Design a protein around this ligand. Structure first.
Ligand SMILES: *[C@@H]1O[C@H](CO[C@@H]2O[C@@H](C)[C@@H](O)[C@@H](O)[C@@H]2O)[C@@H](O[C@@H]2O[C@H](CO)[C@@H](O[C@@H]3O[C@H](CO)[C@@H](O)[C@H](O)[C@@H]3O)[C@H](O)[C@H]2NC(C)=O)[C@H](O)[C@H]1NC(C)=O
Ligand SMILES: CCC[C@H](N[C@@H](C)C(=O)N1[C@H](C(=O)O)C[C@@H]2CCCC[C@@H]21)C(=O)O
Ligand SMILES: CC(=O)N[C@@H]1[C@@H](O)[C@H](O)[C@@H](CO)O[C@H]1O
Ligand SMILES: *[C@@H]1O[C@H](CO)[C@@H](O)[C@H](O)[C@H]1NC(C)=O
Ligand SMILES: [Cl-]
Ligand SMILES: [Cl-]
Ligand SMILES: [Zn+2]
Length: 575
């Protein structure tokens, strides 16, 4: 009966708001204030939101969704029938919740210490080492140290996490957790679709990789860089080698065309974390999109507390499920990398605000990729030399242009293989083809195969390098970032065309375009109410994911890399 189904969705929606709001409160409090106490209230509210999920979920499963005519209702009920962890028996649920908490806590409080010297946390200290040291041995100390302290300490938890997450997936009708994660795209051809996108980025990626390898060879010496082999994973300016723009100084295409020290510019001009968020807010409002509410400025944690409070530093954006309270929790350092991060997070806030009037079951991105893409799209415009000039962080030439595209490539292109491999690994862990006997080995096998990277120190038994990357102990799916990086360029392209830009796509800055804002807004308003091809069609006027926009953006760089690599005789790739 349609009327009983409609009443159920109404009752689900009012009751979810309340319970989700409380849960979000306690999680927030833990995340911003890791103590025995907040941890206990968190584990408590876990049981509460599960009891709600189990009640409504058991109700939802009694409806034959086949017989439902209204498609919105049908879709809400189908999703409520998935209980996630709340399908587990009470004992296993308690253990699962404890395992997650323990993994996240371990990661978030790990330090790496010099004997008789000072301890370094990941943010800011170890991050700053990976970004600015140009000494092999110091990079190595930070890279190995982090894996020794974060990664190896996660290993004790991960087999049990895999068992429980998979058990929950099976109890919701999936074959394993990885199947459940992939189902969020509602795209049976996902794996194939992503593989093809990955393959189209290989020319750019291999040419980038070879040119960076050459430059590393020049700086670190021939005894440390094989010009036909993988790059050591500690030399790319980032703990995970997932983005390479911190080694821009080593790889500048045109060192004659100098570029401002944007960090020193930000610092010298008294930028603060608050200023960084306010500029993102200005950009969203310039498009005719929504401002963040006053409450956001009062409640968000935009820098690392100095008061001895221990926190989850890893930046994140929060929906409190009442349509009024949205926040960001970021340990913001004043630099360009973090400004892009602030935009990314403000993009999530903007989405929470555009879909806040949907039923809570439909308050998500069209697919998780879309959620990740919004803030990045704006940041692409922010990053342009012309925009950075207007912010007084930079001072025509082909030389400055190739330099710019290189800077962008070191972020965008370098991330393509990393973002692809993380869930290639986890999918295989979840489906049981990687056991705990070879977690680490299979990880490095994909690091090699996709990114062309090798470990600077041979791994041993007891290593679990995956555990040294946040998303792994925190159980946050990763393929969304791969989708994001592809579709963000398609969105930029479409927004630029809508805004009347002509000329090379990389020169576009959509600041203040209402036409561009209006496309984003009508897509974000759909939330999860329709298949994601419809939101794609709304923004871009076609319904597929496609690498052609990102290739078009980087085409002048591709031509330059090819000429450069050919001139030097590079052999692209590695064995
Ligand atoms: C299938 O059912 C959906 C959902 O219906 C809504 O949710 C149910 C659980 C019940 O509570 C329904 O009584 C309830 O309306 C229908 O979608 C809804 O359609 C209405 C009217 O077309 C939309 O209303 C708009 O509301 C805005 C304010 O937000 C007004 O300013 C607009 O002028 C406009 O009238 C409403 O957004 C929409 N709801 C959702 C969540 O999508 C749908 O129409 C129906 N399909 C069929 C076959 O009729
Ligand atoms: C709970 C998820 C937090 C996550 N935190 C950010 C900082 C994050 O982990 N990442 C990913 C990462 O840092 O591994 C890459 C992604 C794209 C560029 C901006 C930062 C984004 C996010 O907001 O998606
Ligand atoms: C401002 C406002 O009233 N928003 C509500 C929203 O909370 C609710 O989820 C939806 C119907 O479920 O209708 C609308
Ligand atoms: C941190 O948590 C403790 C223990 O729950 C609490 O008593 C204290 O007031 C909190 N500090 C902040 C900054 O909220
Ligand atoms: Cl690693
Ligand atoms: Cl995802
Ligand atoms: Zn994100």
């Amino acid at each position: 009966d349609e009327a009983e189904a409609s009443k159920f969705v109404e009752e689900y929606d009012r009751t979810s708001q309340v319970v989700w709001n409380e849960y979000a409160g306690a999680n927030w409090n833990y995340n911003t204030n890791i103590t025995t106490e907040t941890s206990k209230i968190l584990l408590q509210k876990n049981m509460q939101i599960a009891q709600h999920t189990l009640k409504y979920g058991t109700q939802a499963r009694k409806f034959d969704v086949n017989q439902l005519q209204n498609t919105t209702i049908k879709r809400i009920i189908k999703k409520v029938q998935d209980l996630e962890r709340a399908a587990l028996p009470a004992q296993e649920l308690e253990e699962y919740n404890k395992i997650l908490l323990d993994m996240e806590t371990t990661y978030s409080v790990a330090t790496v210490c010099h004997p008789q010297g000072s301890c370094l946390q990941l943010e800011p200290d170890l991050t700053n080492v990976m970004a600015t040291s140009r000494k092999y041995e110091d990079l190595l100390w930070a890279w190995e140290g982090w894996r020794d302290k974060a990664g190896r300490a996660i290993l004790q938890f991960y087999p049990k996490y895999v068992e429980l997450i998979n058990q929950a997936a099976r109890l919701n009708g999936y074959v394993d957790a990885g199947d459940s994660w992939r189902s969020m795209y509602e795209t049976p051809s996902l794996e194939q679709d992503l593989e093809r996108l990955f393959q189209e980025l290989q020319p750019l990626y291999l040419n980038l990789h070879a040119y960076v390898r050459r430059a590393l060879h020049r700086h670190y010496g021939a005894q440390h860089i094989n010009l036909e082999g993988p790059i050591p994973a500690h030399l790319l300016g980032n703990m995970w080698a997932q983005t390479w723009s911190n080694i821009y100084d080593l790889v500048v295409p045109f060192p004659s065309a100098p570029s401002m020290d944007t960090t020193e510019a930000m610092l010298k001009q008294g930028w603060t974390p608050r200023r960084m968020f306010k500029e993102a807010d200005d950009f969203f409002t310039s498009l005719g999109l929504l401002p963040v509410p006053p409450e956001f400025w009062q409640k968000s944690m935009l820098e690392k507390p100095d008061d001895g409070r221990e926190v989850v530093c890893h930046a994140s954006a929060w929906d409190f499920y009442n349509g009024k309270d949205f926040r960001i929790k970021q340990c913001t350092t004043v630099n360009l990398e973090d400004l892009v991060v602030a935009h990314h997070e403000m993009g999530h806030i903007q989405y929470f605000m555009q879909y806040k009037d949907l039923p809570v079951a439909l308050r998500e991105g069209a697919n998780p990729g879309f959620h990740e893409a919004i803030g990045d799209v704006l940041a692409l415009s922010v990053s342009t030399p012309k925009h950075l000039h207007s912010l007084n962080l930079l001072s025509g030439s082909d030389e400055h242009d190739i330099n710019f595209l290189m800077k962008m490539a070191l972020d965008k292109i370098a991330f393509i293989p990393f973002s692809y491999l993380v869930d290639q690994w986890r999918w295989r862990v979840f489906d049981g083809s990687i056991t705990k006997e070879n977690y680490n080995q299979e990880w490095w096998s994909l690091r090699l195969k996709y990114q062309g990277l090798c470990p600077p120190v041979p791994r041993t038994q007891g290593d679990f390098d995956p555990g040294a990357k946040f998303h792994i102990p925190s159980s946050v799916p990763y393929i969304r970032y791969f989708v994001s990086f592809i579709i963000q360029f398609q969105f930029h392209e479409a927004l630029c065309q809508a805004a009347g830009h002509t000329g090379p796509l990389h020169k576009c800055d959509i600041y203040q375009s209402k036409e561009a804002g209006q496309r984003l807004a009508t897509a974000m308003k759909l939330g999860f109410s329709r298949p994601w091809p419809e939101a794609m069609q709304l923004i871009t006027g076609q319904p597929q994911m496609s690498a052609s926009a990102m290739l078009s953006y980087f085409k002048p760089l591709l031509d330059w890399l090819r000429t450069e690599n050919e001139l030097h005789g590079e052999k692209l790739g590695w064995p």
